[PDB]
Amino acid sequence: SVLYNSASFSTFKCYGVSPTKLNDLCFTNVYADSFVIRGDEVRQIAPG
Amino acid sequence: RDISTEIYQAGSTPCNGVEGFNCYFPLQSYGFQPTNGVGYQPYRVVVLSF
Incomplete structure (x- = not known):
């Protein structure tokens, strides 16, 4: 909920799951990969 | 039948102006280019009710 309400991002549209709300459904072994990029390749964060 | 296009507020922050x-x-527009193959061509639908 904090990520949803807080307005400090530039992209919060999930390519995998419906953006309605995720605190209801249940999953296991959450995966998360992070990195840092230059501002010019912001168009690479997309399926494909 | 719905015809309205008034600004849809998503979050808790009030919105009264523009984007x-x-x-x-x-409203968001359909994309119909000649290059698109099957599954993206205009299908005409007629529904009859009695």
């Missing part, structure tokens, strides 16, 4: 965060207008 902004967590408030958008709903």
